[PDB]
């Protein structure tokens, strides 16, 4: 069929063509070969599914906004369309989660990769949580927290407070508290602590990632600035 480097090339093409389902299909196939992913492959996989699920999350939100309109077979039509989108979303997140649990998290050698993949797992259980209900929601919310927590603890121990992955994890975990658990309190607490710690140890920045670190440091302040109201 196609070998790793051909798949990776296809994935790069898809990306520029803005064909993200293709890009994800290619990176899904590379992952399924069962070898630890290079930093480049890892980021291609992440970008691909982020865009794939992002499109559905976006559509879900549009329809939801609309749905909040007082008639009702139009609200019955709109509800069924939201569910159709939700179902697509769930299939995407479950594909990713399966990839993470079957290949990525278990095989990750460096603390860096493990935190990255565990944060990813937090993210995609968080995306299920945005649209879940009933008992399913409790499950996805708890699994999201578990992955974020495990990654949180490992990063505090293994990475500098200015590492972009560590900061990104903190950004998303705090977003989890705010938007999913409805804990503005611990969200701002988490964001502010992560920012402060980074500020304190600005001497831990390095050449490869100092731009990414400062950008994420800035998103943390923005979220914080946006939430404290």
């Amino acid at each position: 069929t196609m070998d790793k480097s051909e798949l990776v090339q296809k994935a790069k093409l898809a990306e520029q063509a803005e064909r993200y389902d293709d890009m994800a299909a290619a990176m899904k196939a590379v992952t399924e070969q069962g070898h630890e992913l290079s930093n480049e492959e890892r980021n291609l996989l992440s970008v691909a599914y982020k865009n794939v699920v992002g499109a559905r999350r976006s559509s879900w939100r549009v329809i939801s906004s609309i749905e909040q309109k007082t008639n009702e077979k139009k609200q019955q039509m709109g509800k069924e369309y939201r569910e159709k989108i939700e179902a697509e979303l769930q299939d995407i997140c479950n594909d990713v989660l399966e990839l993470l649990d079957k290949y990525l998290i278990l095989n990750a050698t460096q603390a860096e990769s493990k935190v990255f993949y565990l944060k990813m797992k937090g993210d995609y259980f968080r995306y299920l949580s945005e649209v879940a209900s009933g008992e399913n929601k409790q499950t996805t919310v708890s699994n999201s927290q578990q992955a974020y927590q495990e990654a949180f603890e490992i990063s505090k121990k293994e990475m500098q407070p200015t590492h972009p992955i560590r900061l990104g994890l903190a950004l998303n975990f705090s977003v989890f508290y705010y938007e999913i658990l409805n804990s503005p309190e611990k969200a701002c607490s988490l964001a502010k602590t992560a920012f402060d710690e980074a500020i304190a140890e600005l001497d831990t920045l390095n050449e490869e990632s100092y731009k990414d670190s400062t950008l994420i440091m800035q998103l943390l302040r923005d979220n914080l600035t946006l939430w404290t109201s």
Partner: peptide
């Protein structure tokens, strides 16, 4: 780079307005 920031602001703000 303000492109990332503004996009993040929009996405986050959506939650605040449309679902408190």
């Amino acid at each position: 780079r303000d492109k990332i920031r503004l996009n993040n602001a929009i996405w986050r703000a959506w939650y605040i307005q449309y679902v408190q």
